[PDB]
Amino acid sequence: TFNLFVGDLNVNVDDETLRNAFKDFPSYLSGHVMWDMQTGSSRGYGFVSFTSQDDAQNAMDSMQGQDLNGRPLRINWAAKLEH
Structure with missing residues (x-):
C-alpha cells in the first residue's frame, strides 16, 4: 500500500473528519x-x-x-518519525 502522513491537524479533527476529507480520492x-x-x-x-x-x-x-x-x-509520504 501507499501511505500519506497528514500533519497540522486541528486537535478537533477526529477519524470521521479526516476520512471525509480523503474518502473520494481514487484508490483510497x-x-x-x-x-x-x-x-x-x-x-x-x-x-x-x-x-x-x-x-x-x-x-x-x-x-x-x-x-x-x-x-x-x-502532507508527506509516511516515514519513520524522527527524534
Whole structure:
C-alpha cells in the first residue's frame, strides 16, 4: 500500500473528519488520526492509505496546504518519525 502522513491537524479533527476529507480520492483505502494512548488527546496528525502510488501522490498534491477545520494540511509520504 501507499501511505500519506497528514500533519497540522486541528486537535478537533477526529477519524470521521479526516476520512471525509480523503474518502473520494481514487484508490483510497482508509484514514486514522493519531492520538496519545496515555491521554486520549490527538497528536495533530494522521495517516491516509491508498492502493496506488500515483493516486496517493495525486491526493497529496491535490490536498497539500488546503485547509481542514481552519488549518493547512501538511502532507508527506509516511516515514519513520524522527527524534
